[PDB]
Design a protein around this ligand. Structure first.
Ligand SMILES: NC(=O)c1ccnc(NC2CCCC2)c1
Lengths: 244, 178
């Protein structure tokens, strides 16, 4: 993450991020809505950060320091470039929506009134098809990536020293290789929980309640499709095992 | 310190997310209770042993039968949750959650946890349940279910007041060490 976005999302809530004199001017219902939208953007910033640790710290570090076969590194980090592209673009749109809503003379005071349209765009058309194909591929390769990691850590000394070295800082405590993989797999099932709670506090404008209801339906359709498209790959699986 | 992995399972209204949030922050949030929990690695010292306990939630995965099992690899202890204000969440324990966890996590200790124990003596809760010929889950009903499903043990807690929360995670760490 970059310092500017980290500071903007350092607080535990929207009500603690904005100035108290700005918070005071809003009704409780607006505050409750903004606290959940803030959590959606904050967790998206953290998810993009998880993807950067996987691409820049682990993947590129292995290619540069271990000179490991590119096919082995790909098995450990399936679809990480495509996932980073999808979520960095989504994060860019969420952060721009917040930035446009800032009051003049402030870098922290804002109210996002129109999130639904952005979520409909993300979870429909080509971007939704790309998310569907990418998570179907990622989640089907998840178990294989973990087994490949566990084999390499146990039999390779330079790989073990690489992992121990790059994961030693305290800021990496929750972000080991296996932890990043499960964090990415679990991300997509967080969206209906966040959107349903934003919707609960978005009845004030009928256009917004309708947009969030459509977005919620699109996210669930995407998840149902991803879930149906998963078939766990296994290194050294035989054709007979597959067709039976 | 040895690394252990804990996963919490249970129905959508069982309070598993709130339980993980309260333990990881050591507080019931006074300003905003998060909707979701990413992960956390707790430094725990139990009975003289230091453990790094990685915590994971299955919330949001309840309707997705092929995504949900991806949370299970290398799990060391399962917390199987139900809500005491929801006798229906207890009934789904033996024939939905238990066969699933025994299949993907053979030989992993399961601790059956009754959440929201504060609601057992809450007037509104008792009134609403009485309209459907029901009452809050009794301590013996929780123990009997835990005994029936082959659970390592039975425990109760309240994420709202923090009572029993520390004990659940310390016992989970001991179960993961066995
Ligand atoms: N027996 C222990 O070491 C212990 C007790 C209570 N909580 C612990 N976990 C931390 C993680 C975040 C909040 C405190 C650890």
């Amino acid at each position: 993450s970059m310092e500017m976005d980290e500071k903007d999302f350092a607080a535990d809530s929207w009500s603690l991020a904005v100035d108290s004199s700005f918070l005071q001017q809003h009704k409780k219902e607006v505050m409750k809505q903004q606290d959940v939208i803030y959590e959606l953007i904050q967790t998206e910033l953290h998810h993009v950060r998880t993807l950067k640790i996987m691409t820049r710290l682990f993947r590129t570090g292995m290619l540069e320091e271990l000179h490991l076969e590119p096919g082995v590194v790909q098995g450990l980090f399936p679809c990480v470039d495509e996932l980073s592209d999808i979520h960095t673009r989504f994060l860019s749109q969420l952060l721009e929506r917040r930035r446009q809503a800032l009051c003049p003379g402030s870098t922290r005071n804002f109210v996002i009134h129109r999130l639904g349209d952005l979520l409909i765009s993300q979870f429909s058309g080509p971007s939704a098809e790309q998310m569907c194909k990418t998570y179907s591929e990622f989640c089907s390769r998840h178990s294989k990536a973990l087994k490949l990691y566990k084999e390499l850590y146990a039999r390779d000394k330079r790989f073990q020293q690489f992992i121990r070295k790059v994961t030693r800082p305290a800021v990496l405590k929750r972000h080991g290789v296996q932890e990043c993989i499960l964090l990415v797999t679990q991300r997509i099932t967080k969206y209906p929980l966040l959107i349903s709670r934003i919707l609960q506090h978005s009845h004030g404008i009928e256009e917004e309640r309708q947009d969030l209801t459509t977005a919620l339906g699109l996210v669930k359709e995407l998840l149902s499709n991803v879930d149906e498209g998963i078939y766990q790959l296994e290194k050294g699986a035989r054709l007979q095992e597959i067709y039976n | 310190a040895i690394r252990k992995k804990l996963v919490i399972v249970g129905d959508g209204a069982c309070g598993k997310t709130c339980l993980l949030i309260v333990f990881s922050k050591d507080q019931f949030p006074e300003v905003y209770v998060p909707t979701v929990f990413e992960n956390y690695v707790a430094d725990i010292e139990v009975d003289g042993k230091q453990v790094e306990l990685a915590l994971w939630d299955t919330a949001g995965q309840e309707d997705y039968d092929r995504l949900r099992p991806l949370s299970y690899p290398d799990t060391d202890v399962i917390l199987m949750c139900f809500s005491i204000d929801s006798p229906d969440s207890l009934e789904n324990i033996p024939e939905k959650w238990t066969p699933e966890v025994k299949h993907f996590c053979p030989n992993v200790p399961i601790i059956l946890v009754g959440n929201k124990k504060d609601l057992r003596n809450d007037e509104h809760t008792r009134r609403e349940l009485a309209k459907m010929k029901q009452e809050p889950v009794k301590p013996e009903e929780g123990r009997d279910m835990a005994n029936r499903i082959g659970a390592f043990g039975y425990m109760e807690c309240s994420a709202k007041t923090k009572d029993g929360v520390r004990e659940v995670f310390e016992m989970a760490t001991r179960a993961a060490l066995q």
